[PDB]
Design a protein around this ligand. Structure first.
Ligand SMILES: [Mg+2]
Ligand SMILES: [Mg+2]
Ligand SMILES: [Mg+2]
Ligand SMILES: [Mg+2]
Ligand SMILES: [Mg+2]
Lengths: 37, 205, 171, 142
RNA sequence: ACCGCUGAAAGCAUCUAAGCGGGAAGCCAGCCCCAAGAUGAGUUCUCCCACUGUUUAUCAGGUAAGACUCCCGGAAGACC
RNA sequence: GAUGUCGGCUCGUCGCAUCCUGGGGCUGAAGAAGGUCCCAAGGGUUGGGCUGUUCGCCCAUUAAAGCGGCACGCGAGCUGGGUUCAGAACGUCGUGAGACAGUUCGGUCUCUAUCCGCUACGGGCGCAGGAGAAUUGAGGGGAGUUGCUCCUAGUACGAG
RNA sequence: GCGAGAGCUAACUUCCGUAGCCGAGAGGGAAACAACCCAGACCAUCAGCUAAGGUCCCUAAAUGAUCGCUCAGUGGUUAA
């Protein structure tokens, strides 16, 4: 859980799927996890 | 669920093995069944039981009829016990068993008007370093200009005691039916010669 | 895009009203769907037709299609999930229809299946979750995989029969 | 000079909440309760009809039933005496959901308060015939 | 929060846009206490029973069932 | 034509940007111990020595010894140690009377609550006859903390 | 409000210029509300038209008509 108020691409593996009113991420590497709340 | 009416008799010292037990002697006398309450007639399921015998002369016509409709013979006390049915007329035999955890409820000995110290625990004040407010007197009842009010529910002096108190999970130590007696480990609320209500543990552990 | 729906042998589809009830040999399934989205037989096989071609309908199109494609598969082929137990002394038995697992927890884990799903154990380190409804089968085998998820150090716990597990290693 | 009063007329009305969106059903009730077509038409006193409501339980609500629609009853001195139910959470007392929308659209005076006495809400259909021994003329919303 | 199931848009993938399950000392219920001035004043059982009094006295007066007042007290209580 | 002012005490309640407990995600997460972020305000958050102290430093503990609001919460509730009256002394300044960036010893804190609000207790009338009892619970309030030890098991994990 | 200085291109700040209103201005509107919007009350009426604002119900008057957009309760707290 690394809450970065700006969820942008880092590598060619990142996936931006819209959920419960937020900008989330479901990347391959476990460290790469980004959320806005 | 299961329940009985009785009279707190007193407290004594008993031994079970080598351990001394503080016991509360209770007379859970015969309780005639006076009214059965059903969802069909009363809208809920319960039983009206009765406790101390009353001289026929002392009983009024409205109570005479109500007792006569069940062929009981005037009691003096009448209490309801919800979700309780068993037929006949309620005694402690097989109602209670040695070892059962019970919930004895009474009416606390009333202590009239009592200060915030005795009643709420408070702290009062210094006995010496210059008072006026020596021991009991509460502090500050509120804040300043904001809640121009004093909080509702504020802990203050009032009538202490003479209240309903249910003491949970009391152990059943001895039972002498026919002697119509039941020994309970610990202390039951209310004074000797007062009404107690022994019920099966409200939510047993 | 999604359009063809193969309906083999003893199929009894009755897409009448909002109750798109699909009966068959393995058991009779019932599944509700959208009314504004058209569905019936226009040949030998099956097809779901969408009126609006904007955005809201295109999502519901591929949804309704695949859902009856899964209910049809269910009434003839059926469904079976194959789970594998991994780790020292990790073993599963059976207590009726109930799955009794022993997975490094002080008190053994019991799971009771819902009305329509069945548990099976060939070797006691392999669990088979077979049922009629792919959702319910997914939702159940899901709970068994949850009893002990494969840890990121020794892959210990419940995994799918052919599942791949990446490993970290600390010491 | 304008027309005076007649009261010896209490009109009972049956309204069905089924599928009707709350606010929109509320408006109709609140209006028949005060005076829409109005008997003598005067505001000085209570001229409105009596409104019986059925199927209170089946009333409709848009984007939020479980979400946002929150009843906010805030109890005696606020020693955190701030109690709040959701609208889905009014699976407890549905007869209140209509009531609080209707009283909400009614005057708040002495007379206004005497107006809720004319609104009788019930959650069922064929059975609510309780307060239905007098007349019971049925009025559909729109 | 978070973890999943079935799953399109986006022939794949995705816990989500349809729907679904799990998940906190928190929320609602459960425990103890108050509670129908809940003027929306609720329910049940039992009792008494349908007196009498002029267009002068417009509803008062004997009464029932029942209670109160007074006395003697009280592990009730400032008074009540 | 006056809205008493630091600190103590007393009494509370509220926010969460959470100190402890509770649930999670990531970890440079083997385990044990942690770091960090997310959700979370239900309860809980110790006693002393120094100083008027708030603070802070220290002793000894702890699950923890949270941060802030409420007229820097609370003197018609208490204190009066700090500060800001009159006395007196020191250092400094002024020729002086005096003064202070100071320091020091001393120094009157006003029996009766009207309204609202709050705790307790009655009297009245209502609740479509007059009565004696037994009640359902709309609603409301109270409560809500946590250690250590054992078992599982010297097991999983670790070369240990 | 506009044009400037001072100020942090802060203040319901200060100080000039300029226009209006309040001061000394009632009436409608803006929930409430000197100033903003409309509008300047000689008195009477249980007559009529409008302005700013409005037309679900509280609350006067279209739950108007047409083509659209937004499903967040956005509308009904600001930014990189
Ligand atoms: Mg003391
Ligand atoms: Mg759950
Ligand atoms: Mg001051
Ligand atoms: Mg004061
Ligand atoms: Mg900017």
């Amino acid at each position: 859980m690394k809450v970065r108020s700006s969820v942008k691409k880092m590598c060619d593996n990142c996936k931006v799927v819209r959920r419960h009113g937020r900008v989330l991420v479901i990347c391959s590497n476990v460290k790469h996890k980004q959320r806005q709340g | 669920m299961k329940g009985i009416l009785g009279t707190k008799i007193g407290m004594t010292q008993i031994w079970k093995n080598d351990r001394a037990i503080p016991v509360t002697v209770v007379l859970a006398g015969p309780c005639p069944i006076v009214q059965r309450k059903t969802a069909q007639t009363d809208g809920y399921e319960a039983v009206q039981i009765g406790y101390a015998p009353k001289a026929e002369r002392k009983v009024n016509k409205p109570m005479q009829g109500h007792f006569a409709k069940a062929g009981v013979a005037p009691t003096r006390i009448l209490r309801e016990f919800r979700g309780f049915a068993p037929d006949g007329d309620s005694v402690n035999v097989d109602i209670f068993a040695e070892g059962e955890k019970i919930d004895a409820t009474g009416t606390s000995k009333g202590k009239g008007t009592q200060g915030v110290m005795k009643r709420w625990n408070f702290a009062g004040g210094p006995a010496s370093h210059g008072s006026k407010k020596w021991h009991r007197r509460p502090g500050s009842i509120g804040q300043r200009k904001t809640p121009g009010r004093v909080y509702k529910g504020k802990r203050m002096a009032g009538h202490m005691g003479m209240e309903r108190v249910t003491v949970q999970n009391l152990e059943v130590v001895e039972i002498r039916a026919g002697e119509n007696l039941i020994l309970v480990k610990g202390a039951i609320p209310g004074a000797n010669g007062g009404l107690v209500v022994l019920r099966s543990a409200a939510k047993a552990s | 895009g999604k359009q063809p729906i193969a309906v083999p042998s003893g199929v009894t589809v009755n897409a009448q009203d909002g109750v798109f009830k699909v009966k068959g040999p393995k058991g009779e399934l019932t599944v509700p769907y959208n009314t504004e989205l058209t569905v019936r037989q226009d040949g030998d096989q099956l097809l779901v037709e969408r009126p609006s071609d904007a955005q809201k309908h295109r999502a519901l199109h591929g949804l309704t299609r695949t859902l009856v494609a899964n209910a049809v598969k269910g009434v003839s082929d059926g469904y079976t999930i194959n789970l594998e137990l991994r780790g020292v002394g990790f073993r599963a038995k059976l207590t009726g229809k109930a799955l009794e697992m022993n997975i490094g927890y002080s008190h053994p884990v019991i799971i009771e299946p819902p009305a329509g799903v069945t548990f099976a154990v060939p070797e006691p380190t392999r669990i088979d979750v077979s049922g009629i409804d792919k959702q319910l089968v997914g939702q159940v085998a899901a709970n068994v995989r949850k009893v002990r998820k494969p840890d990121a150090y020794h892959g210990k716990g419940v995994r799918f029969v052919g599942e791949q597990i990446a490993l970290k290693a600390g010491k | 000079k304008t027309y005076i009063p007649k009261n010896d007329e209490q009109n009972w009305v049956v309204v069905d909440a089924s599928g009707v969106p709350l606010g929109r059903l509320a408006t109709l009730i609140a209006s028949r309760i005060r005076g829409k077509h109005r008997p003598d038409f005067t505001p000085n006193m209570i001229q409105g009809d009596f409104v019986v409501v059925i199927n209170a339980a089946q009333v409709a609500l848009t984007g939020k039933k479980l979400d946002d629609k929150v009843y906010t009853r805030y109890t005696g001195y606020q020693g955190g005496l701030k109690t709040e139910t959701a609208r889905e959470a009014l699976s407890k007392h549905p007869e209140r959901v209509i009531e609080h929308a209707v009283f909400g659209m009614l005057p708040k005076g002495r007379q206004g308060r005497a107006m809720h006495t004319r609104l009788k809400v019930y959650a069922g259909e064929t059975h609510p015939h309780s307060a239905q021994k007098p007349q019971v003329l049925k009025t559909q919303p729109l």
